[PDB]
């Protein structure tokens, strides 16, 4: 519903995501409240994730979300601080949305690239701008869930637009990222499904 | 399944004991010992995230007791492999179909305690529920979560607030962050986590 | 290599593949590559490939030894590039039947005497110790978790007459060494118990 990546019948353009990556839940779901009382957002999720992090995901129009972001991060940073990381996104890739809300493994598909990230927002914001620079197509994807609070995703193309992306996912990353991989030609064992 | 109701159809078994350790391994021998020594009813036994093992029971005051003191002797054996513990001679009603898994609430204000260990957070509810006309809503206990718990208490704001103060008593250092929120969003209202 | 159920068979449906290679990875893109490399090298059949608590990634496959031989030396050279990703290796020319089908996802018995309990540090240490106590001492394989939900660590239950455990006991000591984390005997578990450790 609220990760389409164009709007329902009816529904006002929402482009922009915001992401929160938090230390503590009982603190996420106090910075949830203060970014949705700030300006109309929509939440799109509010959930505990493994490694015990709270992940809060946000859309609405850009001066929405940037509203509501920054509300967040007071909250956020309130005390000790318990912002982890954070993603504003004014135009977030049609094809990110699908891959928000639980994590997606490829049946079928080509050159690959298998990017492994030490945050969740590292990934959605490394995806995004590699899906901007190269035509690759985003395969599977694991937010926190079952590997500790890290984060990885895959992209597919020719090689060239994969070795593209790839220069552009580390520039993005930075020091988030933690492997990155390139195989220009899997095995027909593994072509298709990587993860099984 | 029923063995985790509040009340019998059956004896009284009202008494409440949990352990909370660091190997899985020694968490079966914690639990033959324990239900060896005392006919104390075993509610789990349970590897959960993080690695550690969680144990519960359930029987007569003087049962837990009993099973407990010879839990502790053998989770303390070598290195020791109790991280938490909690014996309550009654848990409160509402407490009891928290226990067996996660529950996520679909419908005032509230307080969202988040704590280190299993432990805390039954301990922390139970009292907090013993003292304040309050309602427990959502709980998780270690799973997915790196082996910490959180709960929700919904009631007045002086309702919360008077929960709040003996949640902070009775986890001490053990609680990691408590929140209250007086009026939640509509986005929020009923349902916290989604 | 990847497709169908039945590669976790005990005995074929096609030739044997009574060898086993597993390979425990710090980084799930690293994993990629090491499999890649290790069917690359020699024909294995790959069982799986797959990220799991605390991180890692888990290869598994199986084949004749020398293929199961081969795939293993492309894998550790791919692992050990740069910085190694390698947390743990298993390799077993000959895998006790009764593993197979312990492999692909945890196993809780619902019902059996005595039995022992054993808790790993690595998921490789679990296979390898429970191989060669099957081997060693006339038990019996009946709950086994591999990493997902216990952090990365494993563990695994074998049952039988008492002083045949007990054997398997000393057994799963010398072949685990330092992955050993924690072994627990229990003669008689109790009725509640019997049967169920865990639930
Ligand atoms: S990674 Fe595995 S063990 Fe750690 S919290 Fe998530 S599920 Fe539990």
Redesign the pocket.
Known sequence: ERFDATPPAGEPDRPALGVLELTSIARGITVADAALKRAPSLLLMSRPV??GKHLLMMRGQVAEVEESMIAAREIAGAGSGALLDELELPYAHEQLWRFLDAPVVADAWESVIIVETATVCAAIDSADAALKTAPVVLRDMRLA????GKAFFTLTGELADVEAAAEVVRERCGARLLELACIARPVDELRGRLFF
């Open positions: 493994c490694s869930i079952g590997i500790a």
